């Protein structure tokens, strides 16, 4: 008896034409999140150019039934708010709370918060007409909470276990910024300020994501000294037992309410500046409470993706991810993600190849200490930082990935790729070959 995680089927949809420009303006590493399943429906958000004709860029939201059968994508366009900042840093983050309300935050680079929410719980009480008037107008504050809401970059949403939704983001800028958390009550529709949880000391933290399991909130970050990406140093870790009010390091030592970038009690690996480690890559809490970080560095003597593992007993390991035919990325190459199956035995590396203009779905196993990376699938013709649907992977065993293609405008499309997983038990029965 042995078990193998397998891809039963592979399908794709082209959900739009990518926006014109030199910069990547869809499918970017720090989007949290872009593709979300809530009950029977999958939701996606991305920027599209206005159909008439080229100046205006709008937030677009798709939904499709994914249960109990997969239906067609349909779209609404939020054509009341044109995007002021179409540079590298302004991508959409989307979240869905336990009252079925859909939250959007977008169009940020050191500007005041941009936020909007559905009038109603449209993911719980599902409307049949999918139109832009489902969403309230854009606001620059969080009702019931307090700023500072400026200068804001990188809205990240994290659904908690009780229907509530965290919103996290940087205030200040590159090489001088603080990180704040706000909590939405699904129960009241009010935000409360959890305040500054990381204080920059003439630098800023860049978090890899927010992960939640059994009452515990996990995060990991590097520290950036200046606006130049070469000036990232350190891989840090902390977790909260009260959804981001109170924080503890890997040794379970409680921390000062604002964590300082200067305090190395949170440091879990020494990575100096100019190690070619990029900010805002990937992390994961697997369903067995093991914590993962995806970064990269050239420290081994080669540029390679690095897997940091925090084994449940507080002990850390670092192991390069070098499966056959994966080109190791440099500082400015597309950033990847880690996903986990419901069982918690199978770890997926969703790793864009820096040369091949494709994204690899690699799998490793807890049994073999996550050192057994196998190529399981490949998304071809991508120039993207892959983003996936953690809810749909957990509750349907389907790995659903938002990608931006490689190539020029207008050939370059936005797509969703669905890899139907099949965990196979193998019985090998010895049988008679005798006369
Ligand atoms: C590596 C780079 O980091 C973030 O963008 C930075 C960027 O380094 C630079 O223009 C300046 O530092 O502004 C940005 C900032 O204030 O954060 C983003 O993660 C980019 O996608 C990434 O390329
Ligand atoms: C605290 O954590 C670091 C790893 O982050 C480790 O090197 C050190 O041994 C730990 N110290 C204590 C007192 O547990």
Author numbering: -3 to 431
Task: List sentences from the manuscript.
Activities of His105 mutants (H105A and H105F) were also significantly reduced, highlighting its possible catalytic support function. Therefore, we used the H105F mutant to obtain the complex structure with Rha–GlcA. The Rha–GlcA complex crystals were prepared using an inactive H105F mutant (described later). The ligand-binding mode of the Rha–GlcA complex of the H105F mutant was similar to that of the Rha complex, although the positions of Tyr26, His85, Phe105 (His105), and Tyr150 differed slightly. The GlcA residue of Rha–GlcA adopts a distorted 1E conformation (Cremer–Pople parameter: ϕ = 249.7°, θ = 111.3°, and Q = 0.619), which is clearly different from the stable 4C1 conformation in solution. The Arg166 side chain forms bifurcated hydrogen bonds as well as charge interaction with the carboxylic group of GlcA. Therefore, this conformational distortion of GlcA at subsite +1 is caused by hydrogen bonding with these residues, notably Arg220.
In this study, GA-specific l-rhamnose-α-1,4-d-glucuronate lyase from the fungus Fusarium oxysporum 12S (FoRham1) was cloned and characterized. The structure of FoRham1 comprises a seven-bladed β-propeller domain, and the Rha–GlcA is bound to the cleft at the center of the anterior side. The active site of FoRham1 is located on the usual anterior surface of the β-propeller fold.
